[PDB]
Write a protein that binds this DNA or RNA. Sequence first.
RNA 1: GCCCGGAUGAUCCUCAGUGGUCUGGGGUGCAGGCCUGUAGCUGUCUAGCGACAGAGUGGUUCAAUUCCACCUUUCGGGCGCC
Lengths: 441, 441, 443, 443
Amino acid sequence: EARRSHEHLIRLLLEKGKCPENGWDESTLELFLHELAIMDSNNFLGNCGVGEREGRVASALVARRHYRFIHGIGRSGDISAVQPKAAGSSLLNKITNSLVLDIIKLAGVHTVANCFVVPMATGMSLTLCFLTLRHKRPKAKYIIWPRIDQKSCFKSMITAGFEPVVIENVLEGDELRTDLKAVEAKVQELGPDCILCIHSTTSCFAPRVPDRLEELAVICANYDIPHIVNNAYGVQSSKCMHLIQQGARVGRIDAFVQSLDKNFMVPVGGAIIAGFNDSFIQEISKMYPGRASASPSLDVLITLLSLGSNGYKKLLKERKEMFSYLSNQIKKLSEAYNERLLHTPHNPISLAMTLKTLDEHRDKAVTQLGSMLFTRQVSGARVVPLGSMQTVSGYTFRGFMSHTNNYPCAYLNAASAIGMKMQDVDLFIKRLDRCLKAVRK
Amino acid sequence: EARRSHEHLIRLLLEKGKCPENGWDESTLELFLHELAIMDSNNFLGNCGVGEREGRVASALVARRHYRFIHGIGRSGDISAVQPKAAGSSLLNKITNSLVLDIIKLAGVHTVANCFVVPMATGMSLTLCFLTLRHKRPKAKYIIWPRIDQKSCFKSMITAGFEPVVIENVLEGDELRTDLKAVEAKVQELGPDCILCIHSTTSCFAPRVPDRLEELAVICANYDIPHIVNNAYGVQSSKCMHLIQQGARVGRIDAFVQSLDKNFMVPVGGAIIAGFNDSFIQEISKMYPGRASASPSLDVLITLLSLGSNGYKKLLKERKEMFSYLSNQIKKLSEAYNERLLHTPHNPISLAMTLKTLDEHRDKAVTQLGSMLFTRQVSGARVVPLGSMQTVSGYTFRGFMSHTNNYPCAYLNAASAIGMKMQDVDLFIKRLDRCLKAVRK
Amino acid sequence: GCEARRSHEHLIRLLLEKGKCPENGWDESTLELFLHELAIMDSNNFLGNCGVGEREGRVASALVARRHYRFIHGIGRSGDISAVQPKAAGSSLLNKITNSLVLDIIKLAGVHTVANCFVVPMATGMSLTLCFLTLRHKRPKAKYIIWPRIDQKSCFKSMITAGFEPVVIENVLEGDELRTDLKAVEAKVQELGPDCILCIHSTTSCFAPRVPDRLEELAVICANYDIPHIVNNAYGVQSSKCMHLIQQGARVGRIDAFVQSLDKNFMVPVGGAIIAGFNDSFIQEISKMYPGRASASPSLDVLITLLSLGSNGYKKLLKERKEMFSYLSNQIKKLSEAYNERLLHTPHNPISLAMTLKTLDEHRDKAVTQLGSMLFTRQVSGARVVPLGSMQTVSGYTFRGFMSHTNNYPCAYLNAASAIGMKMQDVDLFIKRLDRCLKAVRK
Amino acid sequence: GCEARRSHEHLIRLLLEKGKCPENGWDESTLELFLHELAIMDSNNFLGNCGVGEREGRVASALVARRHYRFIHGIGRSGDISAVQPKAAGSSLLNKITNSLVLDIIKLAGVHTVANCFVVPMATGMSLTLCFLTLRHKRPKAKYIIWPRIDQKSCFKSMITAGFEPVVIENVLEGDELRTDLKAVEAKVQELGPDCILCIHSTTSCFAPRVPDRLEELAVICANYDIPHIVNNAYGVQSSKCMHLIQQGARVGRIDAFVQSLDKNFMVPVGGAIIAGFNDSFIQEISKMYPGRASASPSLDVLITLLSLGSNGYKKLLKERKEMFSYLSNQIKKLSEAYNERLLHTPHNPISLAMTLKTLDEHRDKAVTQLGSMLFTRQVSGARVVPLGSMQTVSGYTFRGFMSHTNNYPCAYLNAASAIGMKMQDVDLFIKRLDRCLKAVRK
RNA sequence: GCCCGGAUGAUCCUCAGUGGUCUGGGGUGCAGGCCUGUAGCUGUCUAGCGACAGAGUGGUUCAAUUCCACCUUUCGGGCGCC
Ligand SMILES: *Cc1c(COP(=O)(O)O)cnc(C)c1O
Ligand SMILES: *Cc1c(COP(=O)(O)O)cnc(C)c1O
Ligand SMILES: *Cc1c(COP(=O)(O)O)cnc(C)c1O
Ligand SMILES: *Cc1c(COP(=O)(O)O)cnc(C)c1O
């Protein structure tokens, strides 16, 4: 009976709800998971069910792959409530949220008040935030939104039933940045009462850079306007998390959203809503109708308990290193072809190399390069050609994917995101070169 | 090389996208699943990723438990679009939707036009429907809603940012039913233009019964008002599915929603949106911002391929049998205590036994019985006491859980839902008796 | 809330107290909780672990570690396959328990007087060999093993591998059946002398038309001449007839050990066996004759299985085999008529059946050998086809009329058996595919 | 889209063509695709299946079927553990391949001249026994096995289980080391006569202060007197020193077979071994001496492992063991000084180290025996403690000064070894816990 | 079992024919005076009355029983000499 050392790791978790510093062994992890699962009624031995929702499972494969967690999280009114029918799942939800909160502090935002995991995409998660704000601000019709050419967060505003006010970005050197004048101009033109919130974005593709959060946080605190931050994959960026921390300090940040897959290397499908006003975060929680999947929370729990805060820190560290490596490698490859690495110092995660030497009109070289890269099995390589027209839920974007009507050149994206390895870079550079050379002939 | 017999089962699936009549063996199933998984870029061998979302997975346990399906379903604009980054997942989504459509026909609604799985609860899934309708009907403020005391679908209307018009139910014998007069009275009072849609419910707890769908479908077709059906767990009920089929025939049904767990015995977290106008169903699909989890679609795929349409039919058949068995068993137990089985012929799934012999005021017997049942490990047993006051998102319900301000008596719920076994019933009856006897002393 | 575990613990504590099969099969949840609880008792899985030995339990592949529920150290110590291993308390405990359940099953199955038994991670043939190896030291003058013929290479070679010379006693034709030639056995005990005989090696489960050896008679011959008696019960645990017969032998004569296969009697993967006896002492001797540690895989497999089925589970399987043996039989009768063949009368075989194939010309159309592969390509396994005049050499010994258990059986025949786990669909598929197979030959 | 499979197929086709370890480890996805592809080739997994046999591959527990990747039929046929099984083409193929990878690894590891080898689902001790069993038939007059002493019950008992009488040749003290007494061996060949000797049984991998037997010298003695030579290479595959030594013996003398454990050399669960030789012929003879079918579990485990590690993977492990052996050593030196003990000089052992424990009074404070369990409760496995004057009886033979490999070794000592898979944390944890363990005894 | 094609799967049964709201040959059960009129199914709702759908899955096409793919079944052909 030295299972006391497992008991001890577990007792420590339940007591302080923080990430283990060093990862648990699978043995401890699975032991724990089973102790939880058997607390859910559907797994009770002496159990009869006479309800419509009893966690009955027809496939052994399904039961096993979810570690016998079938009931989901929350009750009918609360995606945060305890349900005597699934005591184990309820406890699971509480812990994983706590672990997440811990990581969010450790990642940069130490003054985060509260947060919760929600089994939706980042897009829908933002929508939930807008749906919640509507009730707090019934006269509001518009969301003010510093442009970013990513369909999910844009659509999120329309799905919620509000009208986006696209605030274009100001070009500074090579970087696209927040037009603080225009924002404050609009809030005045439309009037704060009519503004649902300011919807800013941190993580994004170069040449766009993380919005001027603190400046916006002030505009928001001043005019009493809610500030929601799309931090889709900014948790892995101490620069990004710092911005959030700061804006909340000198100003107002009502909620920030991040994606589970982009920040924690788990399957697509979950997100985190986080804030500094505890009461308001829970209002968003309460806005969710019915129970939700536990699958994303389970993945997060498993990943974090397995990595430990140390494991996570390591990854964050490697990410930075890979960023330099990638940047420096692109500078070199870039030279050999008379292109350059766009000067985007303020973007911690994403880089862009120019493609001015390829002409997209005579022959479709810039487009052609996109396909070649794909067929050569290079994912994430994002070619951005000049002058793309595109409609998204009625609104028409000029020069779409460039984040502004008329950017100087066509370029190509790459990023050091969490999990990336040197091989990723070397193979990229190796294959990008091969593609460029191919386009010459 | 007799793997031709596996190839053949699979080729048959892809070709006609129907449920196998008889279940596949795990061997075939897993073979298939792996062939899909390896079509997703993240699983390619010669793959480098330089994006922010590459399906990177830190836990081997996570990767394995999802059969290496990490990318989710859909793209940024479409939870139904193909993504070259996840060809396998995209194909997975298409097939599982097809299988589902097949089951939905086979279950009663043969004239279903289109449907899709969505990684949300039934509550949020309904919300999505309201969020979509808003754009089609910008002047609309209210949803007309024949009362049902279930927090999730009620909240769903408010989360979507609309105002519920609670239409009370008419008592007929022991049954609570649709007040068709009041509905048409309200549509006239408020005016069709101001009505977002009529929100009816089929599956529910006795003594409420499935709404008069066809009659409502007509009111809706007449006044040009959208009709959305909460069919939460009605797929398992040929009576319920028939109603839907019919309403669509003599009238208008724009979309019906069902829950994945309640109808297919998989973990809580997914739902199905289904309709008869193909174009409109896809409009709801397009309304979803960003990618979504594949976890619910994978469970459904696995379950159905494993059961086959035969397996499913068997379950549906057993459900009916269990219903009689349960009903007849309650009639008997009921007698011995001078209670009775409420006369609710029109409710195919749920039964109710009275509890008039226990007085909830002197001693709290009706409440006490609820706890005793729980501690004795009987789930689904739903005690409904008289006169419960309760607020849900501002609105105050009188006699909550009874579905009407003043129902004749206190009663107790039980249901034959899919998956239930005889043991469930016998243990229930055995333990309910034991509890009642206990309350006497 | 942590009282949900109470129900699980009751099931486990009960197992650890009495070591009997649970009457009703366990639930996967309970089973896996238990397995994990055992595995963390093993030193390799300790959290505060450092290893400086050459055998520490290290596992390179997670896949491997997972699939064996983190049981790595195998079973036993260097000295005893019986001894508890300080390094691996969990595996040790797993092993005590598996042997217990298996003993429990053996009684339930017909041999209620069974003294002791153990699982050994070898095939049946190799497990027999182990018995012989143990007997050698008890009988140093012994060179011969007396063996009523049965055409199956493993049990036959088990004797040669052990270092002895098989003395093949030909069978007696009694009606349709092939039975023990008791007079021939005694003749050989006398000719060679008891002191030169290591043991008599008898077989229970086997193919028709052969039937189980006359254990009672042989048990007495052995008692009288003071010769050990080893019984090959390969797949006889599923037969109350076979088991009761073993029990009878032990009651009236001597039976030193009976061996049976794991995969044939418990529907687990090949590779495991049970050695069982009526003298606790002697059984332990064979156990201690095993050199070093052994795989825990076969034990794990039967533990999981027995725990999942429960006494009732296993019993039910046993009943359904009988029911299927009746069915399969009638079906052969019917098919026989239709084709001018017959179901050879072999009442004394509870498992295997034989159908005639006289109407097939193998010396003309070679219809008998060609029907073999026909049943094969058409996906019928277990269907053994037996020609006349097969010659086969096995380790230097040449058999005449091989596969038939005698030099000249009346006719060519076809085997089919009702083994545990067989479902109605199995017979129906067999009968159908055979009818098609025979029609085909006509053309 | 179905071209994503192309990359996977290249890896597989390459494996099936040359049967060499992939240089770089496979990816789980590829590995599992392959395994499933094999398993569906087995008749038990066929879709159109009916079984009427007594051994059909039926599995009662899904758990069991899953954990074995649906490989149920085991390996071989009744005749050969070498023969392809019509019933189980998949398992057959799995087995050919495993043997191939293992052969590949054995060359890479030092014995480049290796003729053939096979995996056998038995322990090393039992696998040795099998070798002996095979030799018996080649040398019917043989009663004795000549064996340079090494205190380990399994390899010792392997000889008795096989039915022979071990002739224990005491070792020679040379410096700190214990080595082969070549003059003593020859004395016994002469006294007993080559014709009475089944074989000489030598050991490579072992505990300090003993070191690997002088294979070269012994290989020649064997060549001259025409005596077979069986080498116990239990955990020597991880040592290029041991392997090169085996290769040398084969070059200048005779070595009939060398046996090695699976779990000790490949970090898989206990229960498997490899029998290897330089005469393809003789190796096949031992293979055919195995009676019946065998478990596929041990083969599966090494296949998965080797396929996952790749040549490079395994090589790296081999390099890191060396590096750790250096480390562990220096660390013992340092600790020795601090405590007035020393690292016994045993340059000829590449794996095991010994530290003195002279400063401990076992006849006064019993400090030596009590430090044994101390290292144990404090969670240090593999740390063997060796007192003076241990007496032990093993199968009737009584050892004096047991565990030390001689009757009177100068001092009490403590073993620690750098076995494959050992990590720096292992040494550090050991050194720390030992320092604490020794401090403790002072009080 | 895998491969190759001829038919077949459910409008009283069987044969024959054929892209047009099916047309013949024969036979059978019930009704009426050889003639003439009708002749079964299953699934869902229903107390019942009765009503509502489905003739393999889909595809071509103004329209298919009648074409084309596939599936169910049944017949024939070749593969099978552990
Ligand atoms: C289950 C159910 C719902 C939806 O509940 P969710 O938790 O959102 O899946 C809605 N209405 C009724 C009557 C239900 O039973
Ligand atoms: C990934 C991402 C989102 C959210 O996308 P989902 O598919 O909804 O998770 C939003 N904005 C940006 C910039 C993103 O990269
Ligand atoms: C491990 C070992 C053996 C064989 O032991 P088994 O448990 O039977 O595998 C033999 N000799 C030595 C030196 C060993 O270390
Ligand atoms: C199966 C069997 C054996 C043993 O075969 P193994 O493959 O070694 O387990 C012995 N005799 C008979 C009659 C058998 O059926």
